[PDB]
Every structure is written in structure tokens, then in C-alpha cells.
Amino acid sequence: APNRAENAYADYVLDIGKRIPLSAADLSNVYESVIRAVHDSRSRLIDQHTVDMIGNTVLDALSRSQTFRDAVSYGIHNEKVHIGSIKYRNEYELNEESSVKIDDIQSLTSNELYEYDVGQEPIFPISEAGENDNEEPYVSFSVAPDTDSYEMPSWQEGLIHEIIHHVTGSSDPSGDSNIELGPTEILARRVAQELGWSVPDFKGYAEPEREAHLRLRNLNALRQAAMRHEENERAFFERLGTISDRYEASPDFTEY
Numbered sequence: 377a378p379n380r381a382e383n384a385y386a387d388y389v390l391d392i393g394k395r396i397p398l399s400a401a402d403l404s405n406v407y408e409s410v411i412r413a414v415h416d417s418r419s420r421l422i423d424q425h426t427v428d429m430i431g432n433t434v435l436d437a438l439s440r441s442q443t444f445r446d447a448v449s450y451g452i453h454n455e456k457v458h459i460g461s462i463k464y465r466n467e468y469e470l471n472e473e474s475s476v477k478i479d480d481i482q483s484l485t486s487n488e489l490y491e492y493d494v495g496q497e498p499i500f501p502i503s504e505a506g507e508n509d510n511e512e513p514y515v516s517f518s519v520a521p522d523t524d525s526y527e528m529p530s531w532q533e534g535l536i537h538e539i540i541h542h543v544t545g546s547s548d549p550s551g552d553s554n555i556e557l558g559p560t561e562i563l564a565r566r567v568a569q570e571l572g573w574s575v576p577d578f579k580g581y582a583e584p585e586r587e588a589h590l591r592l593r594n595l596n597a598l599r600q601a602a603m604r605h606e607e608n609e610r611a612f613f614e615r616l617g618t619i620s621d622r623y624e625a626s627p628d629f630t631e632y
């Protein structure tokens with residue numbers, strides 16, 4: 377097998393994954409497990425909108441992307457993460473290059489998402505496929521942007537990307553490349569294409585235009601989420617802080 381960080385790993389995963397397809401019954405079980413896993417992720421997600429969007433995105437990919445099904449099937453049959461085991465989080469971190477006057481995410485205000493100097497916004501999402509100490513896998517990712525937002529398809533594609541790390545064991549390029557996507561992003565882009573998610577045609581995982589697109593997508597998703605909860609702004613930033621501190625927030629979003 378190719379190394380998990382080389383582009384070749386993508387087509388390898390799919391070739392092997394296609395050998396044992398998911399029956400409509402297998403798919404049905406996967407489907408229900410994802411519904412459960414996403415619902416169980418409420419306590420680490422910023423809002424119900426984000427819960428809904430994660431579920432919709434993953435289920436739509438299972439329903440309409442052969443590539444995603446092939447990747448998911450690969451993991452089930454080849455000792456990677458079974459997609460139904462993955463839970464979801466919206467962890468953020470302070471931007472250490474920033475200017476903004478805050479000790480913690482809990483004290484942040486919506487004004488501070490606009491009024492800061494340079495390109496140093498106060499916080500960034502943590503976007504990663506990790507596991508907790510009981511080896512239970514999770515994806516941390518940006519809060520969901522608004523329905524019908526410019527940011528939605530890129531957000532969806534990036535979410536699928538992190539899931540691909542778990543379900544296929546793929547990695548990103550070892551070096552910062554402007555001409556190689558890496559096998560995880562290759563697969564995520566194929567899923568996006570099959571689903572009609574409009575994303576920019578980047579060639580390199582770390583190319584400056586991609587990095588800029590991501591930061592701006594994340595900042596706007598955060599601004600949009602904060603605005604959705606303008607009525608309960610302090611509760612919104614406290615919840616984001618609670619999640620980022622790795623504690624459980626209300627699974628029923630009672631602060632809203």
C-alpha cells in the first residue's frame with residue numbers, strides 16, 4: 377500500500393473499498409449510526425443549526441457520493457474508523473498573533489470579530505480528526521455558517537475532509553505544498569464534485585490562496601453564527617468557550 381501521506385493513497389483506498397460495497401442494509405445501519413452520533417454530539421457543538429448541518433452533510437454524502445461510500449466502506453472493512461463512531465466538536469483557540477483585549481473565549485464580543493487590527497482575528501477553529509483518551513474518535517471543525525451562505529459548500533467539503541482522515545487513515549502532505557493536495561484532500565474534492573458542492577479549484581494543500589480562503593470562510597462562519605444568536609450573544613461565546621475548554625455544554629441548547 378502507498379504511504380498514507382502520498383497522493384497515491386487516495387486511489388488505493390477507493391480500489392480496495394470498492395471490493396466490498398455497502399449493501400443497502402449496511403448503508404441503512406451506517407445511516408442510523410451517523411444520526412445517533414451527530415445527535416450525541418450536541419454537547420460539544422455551538423448550536424442546533426450546526427448539529428443539523430453536520431448530519432445533513434454526512435448523510436447526503438453517504439446517499440449521493442460513491443466516492444464517500446467507497447471511503448467509508450474501506451474503513452469498515454480495512455480496520456480504520458467506522459464512520460458511526462465519530463462524534464463532532466466546535467473547538468476554538470485564541471489567535472496568539474491577535475491584538476484583541478481578551479483573557480478567554482468566554483469574554484469575546486461580536487464587535488471583536490470585526491474591530492481588530494490587521495489580519496489577526498481573535499480566534500480560529502481547531503480543524504482536526506482526533507481521539508479522546510478512551511480512543512473515541514472525533515472531528516473538531518468550524519461552527520456551521522448560515523444556510524445558503526457562500527461558505528456552506530467549502531465548510532461541507534472541509535468537514536468531509538476531516539472525516540476522511542478517520543475513515544481511511546489518510547494524511548495530509550508532510551510538507552507545505554502549493555502543488556500537491558495530499559490524499560485526504562484529493563478524496564474530499566472528489567466527494568465535493570460528486571455532490572455539486574462548489575469549491576475553489578486549489579492545487580496545493582498549503583497554497584496561499586487556499587489558506588486565505590479557509591481563514592476567511594472560518595471567520596465568516598463564526599460571524600454568521602454569532603449573529604444568529606445576537607439575542608444571547610454572551611451565552612454564545614460562553615458556549616464556544618465551554619466546548620473549547622473540553623467540557624459538556626447543554627445538549628438541549630438551553631442557554632438560547
Ligand SMILES: [Zn+2]
Binds near residue numbers: 537538541547560
Ligand atoms: Zn487534513
